[PDB]
């Protein structure tokens, strides 16, 4: 189920399936964390948790507002999604543990080298409308996978 393959063979990996969090917010968080060192990534996520840093939105941004914390990132939009941050922190911790124990590597040389977020099937509820009509009220879950390795280049 992993979309990432290579001969590096010194990579830690983790994944979760059917995560009950918004797919778009999680995609943005994972794209934001990519290319960072693991320690910096943990610091950044914790900072996002209390509105010290922001998550820039590059893909799903139609209603996202402009904020000054996004200055200097390539876009003027961003938000502070918390459910996504909690989930991504869990998965990253698991991947780091898998890399350190399997290959005995230390945490100061590990980077976030790959990610992938895919849409999943959600639970269906219903809502009631005027003149005796019924509509749908579904959710938008996702599958997440994170890879940690030595260095991009």
Helix, strand, coil percent values for the chain (each to nearest 5) = 30, 25, 40
Per-position x/- string for 36-75, each x denoting binding to RNA as judged by CB under 7 A, each - no binding: ----------------------xx--------------xx
Minimum distance, C-beta of residue 46 to RNA, in the bound complex (Å)? 26
Q: Retrieve residue 153's tokens.
A: 């280049």
C-alpha dist (Å) from residue 144 to 4, 120, 128: 12, 10, 33
- Please, what's the b/e burial string for 79-89 (b: 16 or more CB within 10 A of its CB; e: otherwise)? bbbeebbebbb
42 labeled part of a ligand binding site: no
Among residues 130 and 153, whose Cβ is nearest to RNA? 153
Contact segment (CB under 5 A) with Mg ion among 27-35, 53-61, 88-96, 125-133 equals 125-133
Residues at the contact surface with RNA, assessed by CB under 7 A = 1-5, 58-59, 74-75, 116, 118-121, 143
Known binding residues for Mg(2+) are: 128
């Amino acid at each position: 189920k992993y979309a990432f393959k290579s001969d590096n063979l010194l990579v830690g990996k983790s994944r979760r399936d059917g995560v009950k969090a918004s797919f778009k917010n999680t995609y943005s968080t994972c794209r934001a964390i990519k290319g960072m060192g693991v320690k910096r990534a943990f610091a950044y996520l914790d900072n996002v948790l209390n509105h010290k840093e922001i998550v820039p939105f590059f893909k799903f941004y139609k209603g996202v507002g402009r904020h000054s914390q996004a200055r200097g990132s390539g876009t003027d939009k961003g938000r502070w999604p918390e459910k996504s941050v909690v989930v991504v922190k869990d998965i990253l911790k698991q991947a780091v543990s898998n890399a350190k124990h399997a290959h005995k590597k230390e945490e100061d040389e590990l980077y976030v080298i790959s990610y992938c977020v895919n849409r999943a099937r959600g639970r269906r509820r219903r809502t009631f409308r005027a003149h005796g009509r019924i509509s749908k009220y579904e959710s938008q879950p996702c599958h997440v996978e994170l890879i940690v390795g030595p260095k991009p280049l």
